[PDB]
Symmetry: D2
Subunit: 252 residues, 4 copies
């Protein structure tokens, strides 16, 4: 199943889409600066790109860490990003009441992994009718994603993306099960699957490259960063993605 | 560090406290009946007791699934339970706005395992001044529990209970690391540690697992009856737990 | 099912048996001194006791670290222990050819966890007719112990002990699943189950040992030097207390 | 570090080598039959090839279940495979005494995962001077492979291949950590690393392909698999395409 996001086609048989940006929105000026670099690099390689940032982060490293500029200024910033660069945007929501106003502006709404089972948030997100990025909890099995998808379906929204982030492996460590992408595709109606390589990883650029390449080898709709260094990285991902997507899936 | 809950002393070197009850509040009469059995059984056994139930099941598998009586009905039932039996109660909270109203009624307020990183919920809970039960997420190591505790301390609340409920072990399975209890005591300033045997079993062995955990010298046991233990077996179950706890607590700390 | 080992009754409903001693047999005089201390303490507390050591460490830190005194000298040392103290002894074997000579001297012969699936060693051990201690591999689930047991049963030996040593938990780490004891009892005909706390890993050793013994076990398996040898008495007083309590109550 | 196995160059920046064949040797004819197909497919695709088989299944579930032809007959079959096809071969050894005789015939000798810490077997294998395939145990961290490599070096053999076969993931399940490949390369002096996709698993054809592709994306010396037929062709075409791309990019 493909998802149209403005002029972008997001799907597991389509050229991969890059999701990336900044952690939290501070100001228009800071935002445009970072977004501009992503846009320049991706445009240079012809890679579809969706800008990501949080406007109000509930899961913070410390209590008093800045949550972001908040809903009102945040959405004004996103509106400006969309107008200036002509790209779609993505943000996370954690309050059911925030889903509707966010969806007026943000093309994709993101369900944080820790809230992925919370019924009221899922329903509120579904009812926006927007594209939804479902972050996979690290303690959830790939075949358990079907139940989250079912809850969205119950609430009337099937425009869903599944976002791999790694799985709990003993204490602290995360491991990405390369077989889980296929299990999600098979059990969830071939919805677009994307790979959040950054979470999955907790030199370090070398690790990220190997892990990103391995994931994208399994034929995926997109790559998601919690992030010319970036250009060199994307050249390698694009090379592999173009190879993979240019071949038909195994014959039956 | 001990915590006083009304006349109960909760602590890792005190007699174990039963945090016992049901999955969800369903009606006043059913709640009062179940709670009366718990009170009757624990009183005769001499085990300090705190009644547990959720007012809402916020994360069921269908949006249409029954979620319980809800917050307003729920708090009315807790008020009646407290009035009738004179015991403390515990419930979980799911949204920051729920914390103060729930905390007005419920002695202990609980942070769901799925919501450990909901920093705004942590803050709202801490601000109530109530005793807090922190459910250790299945994805968090025992050494990392200190990070949640730190946040509550930064938010000005030190009346924290640490509750084991198992650790992720491959897909769709949990294991309880018996060493984790000691790690949490060591690294979180010897705050009360309790064991949720009921949610640790998520995938008959409840007694063996319960006894194993309590052998490591814990402030409390957390369990549900109706998976959960048949209510009529509670008395015989608790006889065994009490026998072992009394023994362990009688031995000098090594 | 109980197992008689000389005058000792080993079983999940009997007073726990201590399987204790040392890693590797390095000497004669030091072995006797260490054993003498285990004997004194266990006799003082009235705990059945079986002396343990390896004469040939097959899995060593380095190629050239001492494997131990070897078969012939090892068995001589075991004979001296038996003669001096009148206690049974346990040692491990690694090659089918070692099974007969070892079993003629040693009251229990042990199957190393790493070798527990090796058919030729299993058959050779079984055919001795000796009591056997089966170390559970860390990569093996409790419900699969019955398969090792059935291989022994096929080769004609039912005098089997099941020994817990923890399960792989992410990388370079072990966790002991307290539920595994019950699984083994239920699926393997209530054969004696014992707990190797040493190789499952210190108030740690104490917490872990007590937790395990709380589940009603035939024995506890440990090494000293590993616990400090002089703290043995305090340790066993605590274990005996819990075991005496648990074993004095009928199963529920 | 590359390893020469006859005219084959095995290394992490060389074209991937297929280590392919069957679970166990049953008979000469079927062995030659299966080997012929791998040779035919690999030759026409241009992929270096080493034929794999066990002479003994030392750890089956019943004492009576079938274990293969055994060492004496086993080695006879390998001798004939090398004669007919002129390819190198690989087999696993289970006892120290088997090492020198097996090594006389078999180009690569393999240290089973379960036995990888058996110090006498490590020494015996090292003493043959043969190329050695070290199967990483499912319980062992990738950073711990250097300890096994260190032993072979102290025993005087550095012709070592490191072979991924999955890591224990709860009970009765395996996961392959794609970051382990890089850790092994960085900590073990860039010795050839290969990927046993077959034993890492445990329709399923898509699964094996996806997993093989993911592993080979990390830039590996080889792929270790067992066999259908039509699927072998279909499988290797895709693996080669990916490997050719990856190996053409600068590190
Ligand atoms: Cl998560
Ligand atoms: Cl994100
Ligand atoms: Cl609960
Ligand atoms: Cl959890
Ligand atoms: Cl041992
Ligand atoms: Cl093991
Ligand atoms: Cl193999
Ligand atoms: Cl293994
Ligand atoms: Na004997």
């Amino acid at each position: 199943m493909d998802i149209k996001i403005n002029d972008i086609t997001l799907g597991n048989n389509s050229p991969f889409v890059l999701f990336g940006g900044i952690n939290v929105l501070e100001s228009l000026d800071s935002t445009l600066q970072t977004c501009a670099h992503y846009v320049e690099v991706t445009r240079k390689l012809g890679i579809p790109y969706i800008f990501k940032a949080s406007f109000d982060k509930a899961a913070r490293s410390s209590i008093h860490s800045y949550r972001g500029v908040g809903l009102e200024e945040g959405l004004k910033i996103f509106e400006k990003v969309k107008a200036e660069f002509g790209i779609p945007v993505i943000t996370d929501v954690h309050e059911p009441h925030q889903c509707q106003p966010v969806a007026e502006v943000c093309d994709v709404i993101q369900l944080p992994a820790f809230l992925a089972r919370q019924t009221d948030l899922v329903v509120a997100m579904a009812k926006t009718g927007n594209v939804v990025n479902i972050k996979k909890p690290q303690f959830l099995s790939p075949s358990q994603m079907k139940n989250i998808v079912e809850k969205f379906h119950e609430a009337g929204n099937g425009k869903l993306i599944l976002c791999e982030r790694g799985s709990s492996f003993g204490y602290d460590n995360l491991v990405v099960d390369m077989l889980g992408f296929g299990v999600m595709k098979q059990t969830c109606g071939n919805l677009p699957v994307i790979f959040d390589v950054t979470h999955s990883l907790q030199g370090r650029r070398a690790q990220a490259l190997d892990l990103a390449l391995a994931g994208m080898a399994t034929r995926l709709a997109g790559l998601f960063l919690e992030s010319h260094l970036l250009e060199d990285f994307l050249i390698r991902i694009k090379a592999l993605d173009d190879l993979i997507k240019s071949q038909p899936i195994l014959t039956i």
